């Protein structure tokens, strides 16, 4: 602190109050703009409907094709490219399927090789994509 007056409580509090806005992690949480522009509307997960299956070219170094899924969210009507996890799990996603969709892990930031894809597909037609991959549940059709 740069005012050690005994009667300086408000300058020290009112400075700190003003300088907390220059923090990212604070400015984000304490404005509507981060919580509005969030496609999930501040929710953890979100059910949406697959409208196409999309190949996304991996980043500069490594070079695969990352199989993601273009999603119309129910609650918002908003557009999302959400990644599909492990080997050969895009074979489990028929078009126009209700998929439960979570974040990727970095609180709405793009992960690894996948440019501007912040989401993974968790369940497809209310059946878990780990259970389909392990073959425990069979896809109800």
């Amino acid at each position: 602190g740069k005012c050690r007056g005994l009667r300086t409580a408000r300058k020290l509090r009112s400075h700190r109050r003003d300088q907390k806005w220059h923090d990212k992690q604070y400015k984000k949480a304490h404005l509507g703009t981060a919580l509005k522009a969030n496609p999930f509307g501040g929710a953890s997960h979100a059910k949406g409907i697959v409208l196409e299956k999309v190949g996304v070219e991996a980043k500069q170094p490594n070079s695969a094709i990352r199989k993601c899924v273009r999603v119309q969210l129910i609650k918002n009507g908003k557009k999302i490219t959400a990644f599909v996890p492990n080997d050969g799990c895009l074979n489990f996603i028929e078009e126009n399927d209700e998929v439960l969709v979570a974040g990727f892990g970095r609180k709405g930031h793009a992960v690894g090789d996948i440019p501007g894809v912040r989401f993974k597909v968790v369940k497809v037609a209310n059946v878990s994509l780990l259970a389909l991959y392990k073959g425990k549940k069979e896809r109800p059709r």
């Binding site: 299956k53 695969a64 094709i65 199989k67 050969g88 895009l90 074979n91």
Partner: protein
């Protein structure tokens, strides 16, 4: 290379081996006892360096 057509390539084309028949692993304190026996009661002071449990150099 590889469009949407190559999905589940390598998962498909592995020689699918069925699991071996195991005497089932003991669970609870019977296990923690078995772990304690593998480490602190059995083994000897070794020349150079002590090896890892899964070690197969």
């Amino acid at each position: 290379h590889g469009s949407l057509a190559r999905v589940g390539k390598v998962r498909g084309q592995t020689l699918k081996v069925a699991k071996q028949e195991k005497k089932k692993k003991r669970t609870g304190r019977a296990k923690r006892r078995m772990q304690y026996n593998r480490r602190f009661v059995n083994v000897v002071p070794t020349f150079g360096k002590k090896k890892g449990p899964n070690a197969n150099s």
